[PDB]
Design a protein around this ligand. Structure first.
Ligand code: CYC
Ligand code: CYC
Ligand code: CYC
Ligand code: CYC
Ligand code: CYC
Ligand code: CYC
Ligand code: CYC
Ligand code: CYC
Ligand code: CYC
Lengths: 197, 172, 69, 162, 162, 172, 162, 162, 172, 163
């Protein structure tokens, strides 16, 4: 409770297996849309009905649906098109993987990968990674797992996720007066020190 | 992300009124003389390796301390990041030139670039110098008249210069 | 998928024989268990990396079928 | 928002590359198409008040009961709100004409239209047939090329409502 | 492959919605550039043999070292491969012109270009030289918009090589 | 997915020879008639909800069994699935129409679509009937000449009829 | 569907753990309250025809313009559809009573209610005030907690509509 | 914690919906049964010291070697610490009786129980026997349904240990 | 992270010069005496649970205030968190011991533990006390000449003590 | 964050969140018995600086004669002076990689981002490849035993990276 994220930890994990009837699916959609889009408001016009139909039929798993949403126009228009690449990498980590970035090597690698292979490859590097399949796998909606100690994490990852979280109410709009600027530009490359120009 | 049309539309919406006659005339004139803008953008896209290589040559001959051991563009990794930054900035300048508006530039490449460079210790003065060198090397290409119908494009030159100056002054 | 290479997607049937369970026992089922046999869909754009990932995991595949032609 | 130029830049940017030929050709097509759209915007802007009044009267004709006391339409305030709503749709149609894209509609009207129509019990068919009236009225206001563009946007808004 | 039309289909598909005005405007902008593209395709298809032989000779003159024995260029079969490579590049440029998009060029030559060039140790600068040659005489074989479309496609191929 | 341009390039690269003169003539003719195809696809896009509503009315009025309990389109969930599938079919048909190539419809929207319904027990002949009713309404809305300059487009009508009936046969 | 037992078992299987006290305890509550459900449903099934006829009559009094020729409610087949729809809603409300969970109501009426009510231009308010009449008439048919169970379920249906 | 109320609220929140009738039914059952559970809690709190001391003695009787000198159980501090641990367990059983769910048990005792027992060489069998004795004695203390609820919670803790 | 070799390499690179004879001799000496370093790391890894058990016993006997209800390590879950933290810190000190450089320690392990523990509310002073308790309980295992060839390892004892003290001083 | 046997074992242990078992200790012992030939090879390669770098430069000139005359990269005094500087860099990082007994220094300091710099400065990798071939030929004579094998191993890694 001294950390903001009391309720997020208490939040149940959600799973969607093949013979899901109705309300398991309806709850899964709300959980996915709440987490992936960073608690941002998603109007009924923007909701992808075809991806939901594919998920309901079972052609794509929950992970494939997450990948499609990450490649959707809402994800781009909010996190990619309006922010620098640092903020995009941080948002990708926080949403698709549930953890903050651990070091600067991640930013360098992901920025080079984007510049060389495109947004689709950039996103696939997240979902198809071994880390996502370990923690979540095909059938589990991603959750904020950085608040507990994650095997192999850096000392700073918990603090960085605290910086990214901003309460259960707060969200990663890009509708702010600031314009969705990055949060961890100096924390990642200079972890401990503080400087004044 | 905006272009000049969407800027005018958004400003009108904040006022709450239909687009004025003068604003419509300006947008129509922008569209009419926008084929020169297409030529300029194609010139920036087509020659981009030439601009980048020339700017790198003049910068590193001019500023030797970077490519020295312990310099900030010393190893191949830092040099590649340098050239990649030049390429990205030129890419977004061409984007802003086609759009007629610097929103995409100041919104994707410059909202957090000075802080990033400072937190990496990179000399922002040298980055601004690099942007100016790309500006010169790219004007040398835009003013070329080969392959195109001769005309007057002074306004486009001034606009591209202002985009390069926006980048160079919001980095330094 | 916009290009000619992107289309011609492929369908893979995967079995989770002991070579996968023996690894995941040592890693741990922090993802709740499922059935052994399951069928996966893959486009040509990621057909190789998906197969590499499946073989790294330890599963044995049955067949791959070209959905498009 | 989302126009031809903006969609071109966003597509060329997500892939992280310079603007190749196809992007420039689409840009050229939009730039040359911009003229008919501009005088279409001129025509609708000039005929603002007449179009709004006609749309309101078409509303009160096709749905006679709405004007009865005890419903949505009764009360001078509600008539003024109807006129304001029609003005809003018309203005954003002219905006989308000028931008040569469906951006301004999808942002300021279509985004979240169903939720706000449902909350206030507003009937979508009201604005659907008011837009039908405007659609018919630009049958005479605009002729030739620009008429196709104006009709395209009017009907896109209608399709969004329904 | 990726054309203007196919990109329009893909971008309207990803949102799972009908083609709005912007998609149709992009398609129309393609079509209004289709006939100069076909003119250019005819004009630089009727000059295939002279252009390929001249490009091979230009590579030889600019690169004298790729002629004598002790290297790749020396050899009858090697030079037949040179001519066939130049013909391949020219044919794919014709294909891109006809499609009015870099699709065929991208997915045939550009996709995997660096790995192929390294593994077979074919210096790209050979092909930049040949494409600059082709640039030079398409400056005169074509005039007007078709000239520009050629120049643009050959330049995009060059930048892919470089 | 393919369009007729890329299709022709596909045969041309299969033979390996350049596109023949008659091939270029055909493709130029197709491009010149392109604006009529754009009007066709715009008529299909614009009036899609009307097509769907009329097709659903006629289809359900023809076969009362679907509406009734035990019918496959009985509950609100399955009725909404029916309507959504119908509009998806119309959307992909319009895609194919604009592309001028059946590949867009055949290669992705119709792969498992036929067997999926059998897995769900859906009567596929009802799907075919719905497709034909959609075709009839689409032709009604395409024949309309209001707001468009008159002309001859019987080729477009025939091609759209082939697209619709071929989708039905893929389902049938 | 989803009853209390269904929710219990689904959550337990989701957590990968046995039946501890909490969900057995809620199951006890469900079994205990299953009786007012049974007599409420039996009384509702006793009064099918009267309830549906009164409901459609209340609709016609509330929406007289619907009955006019040229409108949705004109004709004999349309009124038959009114009776059929009200019968469907009543049957699903009794189903939700018997199951003592909202489930059947959700997965038969609510599941895709908006899409269907929009495609066929059916109005939610018709059914809302039909269910209001059903409230009014059940206010006398039932007694005790059967009333509150029936009313909570009708309220669920109405909130789904509005 | 994880009560009936809190689990209800959390599952409704995750689905982003209000509380429909099923969760209110579960809450009603919980409120109806609060009286027996609170009765069991007050009976356990009344006979606190006797239960603790009897549990410790039963552990010693079934585990004689634990009383041997130079070993884990020997020592006044370890006797006191046994008493403290059993007091903790009984406290949390009363907590779970009051909260009408295994919230406090899971939060405090069970969460992390296994690895902390491993890191201290505390045999779970000791606490299993202590809880078996407490179950036996609360069979004497509590009659009726308070017995059932208590035994549910002691058995849940026993299952967690075993 | 760095080992000693990589640190010397990085300094020689910043000076832009080859590795001197002196630095080569220091690294050769490190390699020759790296066997004892392996033995020290093996001692740390083989007795990790014992070291944690001793440290926790002595800490919670020294500080009954933590385990006491309402305290920090009370709720039987925070106690497991405490034991896990002991695990992590000992693991990172063993890594820094094998490497020969404290880079892993102060990079991966303890940049933010100060503020992490201030945010979570845990008393950092007790954490530092626990770390130096781990130091004391680990030195007895590190010095243990049982089943290991007898030699001199004063430098390794000093190194391990310095790493534990660095961790304690940072977290404190 | 370079790559070294010690770094590999530490990173694999850390990523799995466990201690270093007997396997990582086996690997570290292997590296520590590596390091005497590796360091003495680096010493022998450092002591013989100027001959190596000058011979590699002249190999670049001889094997690529067309670079020498004007109109090419090799013309202009600063160009060959800075060629000597480049070969000095490559030799230095070979010595660093011998000392570290891993390809960490080569990768991080030369190989990563090599192709982009070579492209954007119009430098043929073949010049450097055959210069490294000459240095390989010389280390075939300055060094003997397993030191020759390991120096050739790192030079081969660099050549494969260039190619
Ligand atoms: C730490 C790893 C690293 C290396 C190795 C490296 C090499 C390097 N090669 C460069 C371009 C160059 N490289 C050469 C080398 C040529 N000279 C001729 O005698 C030969 C045929 C040939 C060498 C075999 C030349 C002439 C340039 C000049 C291009 C320019 O002026 O930009 C430059 C730009 C310096 C300048 O423009 O003055 C560097 C720093 N950079 C690095 O960060
Ligand atoms: C990729 C393109 C695509 C296709 C081809 C598609 C067909 C499709 N229809 C489905 C269900 C359905 N589809 C229908 C419609 C049919 N049954 C009735 O007889 C109607 C007359 C007839 C309409 C043509 C119905 C009633 C269901 C519900 C079946 C069920 O829930 O068991 C499903 C499974 C769940 C879902 O997606 O909603 C698929 C995949 N969906 C897609 O996203
Ligand atoms: C898409 C918008 C965007 C851009 C373009 C961007 C630039 C950027 N430049 C970076 C580092 C760098 N930037 C430069 C370039 C500068 N240093 C040299 O001295 C030159 C004077 C000058 C270039 C002209 C260099 C050399 C580095 C490497 C520093 C390092 O790796 O630590 C980094 C962090 C590490 C990496 O990416 O490898 C970013 C994110 N960030 C963004 O969000
Ligand atoms: C596929 C991408 C694309 C390109 C490349 C393109 C170029 C293009 N340039 C044009 C004219 C022109 N182009 C230019 C621009 C050039 N003249 C100036 O002197 C500068 C040297 C330079 C710009 C800095 C000008 C000034 C005109 C004439 C505009 C006028 O006054 O009508 C035209 C109109 C017809 C013509 O006169 O040829 C086109 C289509 N259009 C496209 O759709
Ligand atoms: C359709 C797309 C396509 C392209 C673009 C292509 C280029 C190409 N040309 C090749 C043969 C070749 N081509 C050349 C010609 C080069 N060397 C010199 O003579 C000239 C300066 C220069 C020509 C401009 C040579 C020497 C080879 C033999 C391969 C080798 O040396 O390793 C090869 C190796 C396999 C073969 O064809 O025998 C490729 C991949 N191949 C394709 O299938
Ligand atoms: C921005 C998107 C867009 C629209 C809205 C569009 C409509 C359009 N239709 C046109 C001509 C035409 N359109 C048609 C097709 C119609 N003729 C009959 O009414 C048939 C019922 C129907 C076929 C379905 C015909 C036959 C022509 C005349 C041929 C021609 O001018 O090329 C033209 C060129 C002549 C002009 O309008 O001044 C346009 C711009 N084109 C576009 O690129
Ligand atoms: C899952 C249970 C279920 C429900 C709830 C349901 C409602 C429902 N009512 C329908 C028809 C209808 N229902 C009505 C009745 C309305 N109009 C007026 O008469 C009244 C004010 C009001 C009723 C009180 C009308 C007029 C139609 C015809 C709509 C049309 O064809 O345009 C339809 C379309 C089916 C068809 O075209 O035959 C549905 C889906 N259907 C179901 O299977
Ligand atoms: C929140 C709830 C909670 C629980 C359940 C709990 C159990 C618990 N008992 C402990 C000590 C202990 N517990 C026991 C076990 C008892 N002593 C013997 O007389 C009996 C045979 C036996 C019980 C039947 C012993 C022997 C110790 C001393 C361990 C030591 O210091 O070596 C410890 C280690 C902390 C310390 O050293 O004081 C814990 C965590 N602590 C909690 O905060
Ligand atoms: C894979 C795991 C592994 C390890 C760790 C390992 C260490 C190791 N220790 C050795 C002897 C030794 N071990 C030590 C270290 C000890 N002597 C001091 O008194 C301390 C009590 C203590 C370290 C703190 C010393 C000093 C030697 C003799 C070498 C010398 O003269 O320094 C040797 C040489 C031959 C032998 O006795 O086995 C090895 C290889 N070997 C392995 O296969």
């Amino acid at each position: 409770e001294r950390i903001r994220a009391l309720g997020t930890i208490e939040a149940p994990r959600v799973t969607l297996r093949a013979p899901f009837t109705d309300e398991q699916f309806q709850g899964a959609l709300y959980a996915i849309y709440r987490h992936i889009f960073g608690n941002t408001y998603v109007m009924e016009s923007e909701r992808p009905t075809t991806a939901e139909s594919q998920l309901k039929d079972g052609r794509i798993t929950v992970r494939g649906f997450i990948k499609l949403l990450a490649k959707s126009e809402v994800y781009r228009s909010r996190f990619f098109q309006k922010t620098s690449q640092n903020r995009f990498i941080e948002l990708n980590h926080k949403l698709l993987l549930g953890r903050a970035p651990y070091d600067q090597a991640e930013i360098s690698a992901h920025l080079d990968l984007w510049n060389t292979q495109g947004y689709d490859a950039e996103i696939d590097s997240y979902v198809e990674s071994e880390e996502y399949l370990e923690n979540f796998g095909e059938d589990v909606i991603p959750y904020f797992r950085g608040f507990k100690y994650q095997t192999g994490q850096s000392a700073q990852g918990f603090n960085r996720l605290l910086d990214l979280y901003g309460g259960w109410a707060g969200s990663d709009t890009d509708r702010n007066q600031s314009g969705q600027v990055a949060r961890l530009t100096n924390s990642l490359v200079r972890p401990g020190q503080v400087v004044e120009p | 992300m905006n272009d000049v049309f969407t800027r005018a539309i958004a400003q009108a919406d904040l006022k709450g009124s239909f687009l004025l006659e003068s604003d419509l005339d300006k947008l129509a004139s922008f569209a009419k003389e926008g084929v020169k803008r297409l030529d300029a953008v194609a010139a920036l896209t087509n020659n981009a390796p030439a601009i980048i290589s020339d700017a790198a040559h003049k910068l590193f001959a001019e500023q030797q301390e970077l490519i020295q051991p312990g310099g900030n563009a010393y190893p191949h990794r830092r040099m590649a990041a340098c050239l990649r930054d030049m390429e990205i900035i030129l890419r977004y300048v061409s984007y802003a030139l086609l759009a007629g508006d610097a929103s995409v530039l100041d919104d994707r490449c410059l909202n957090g670039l000075r802080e990033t460079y400072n937190a990496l210790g990179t000399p922002t003065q040298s980055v601004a110098r690099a942007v100016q060198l790309m500006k010169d090397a790219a004007m040398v290409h835009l003013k070329s008249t080969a392959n195109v119908t001769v005309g007057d494009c002074s306004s486009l030159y001034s606009e591209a210069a202002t985009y390069f100056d926006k980048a160079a002054a919001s980095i330094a | 998928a916009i290009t000619t290479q992107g289309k011609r997607i492929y369908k893979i049937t995967v079995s989770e024989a002991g070579a996968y369970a023996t690894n995941k026992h040592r890693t741990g089922y922090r993802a709740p268990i499922r059935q052994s046999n399951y069928t996966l869909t893959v486009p040509y754009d990621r057909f190789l990396p998906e197969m590499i990932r499946l073989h790294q995991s330890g599963a044995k595949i049955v067949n791959v079928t070209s959905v498009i032609s | 928002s989302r126009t031809v130029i903006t969609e071109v830049i966003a597509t060329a940017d997500s892939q992280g590359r310079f603007l190749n030929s196809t992007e420039l050709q689409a840009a050229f097509g939009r730039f040359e198409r911009a003229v008919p759209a501009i005088e279409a915007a001129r025509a609708l802007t000039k005929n603002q008040d007449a179009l709004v009044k006609g749309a309101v009267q078409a509303v009160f004709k096709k749905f006679p009961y709405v004007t009865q006391p005890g419903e949505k339409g009764y009360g001078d305030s509600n008539q003024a709100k109807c006129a304001r709503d029609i003005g809003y749709y018309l203005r954003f149609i002219t905006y989308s004409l000028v931008a040569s894209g469906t951006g301004p509609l999808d942002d300021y009207v279509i985004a979240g239209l169903r939720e706000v129509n449902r909350a206030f019990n507003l009937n979508p068919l009201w604005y659907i047939e008011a837009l039908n009236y405007i659609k018919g009225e630009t049958g005479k206001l605009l002729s030739g090329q620009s008429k196709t563009e104006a009709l395209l946007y009017i009907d896109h808004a209608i399709n969004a409502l329904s």
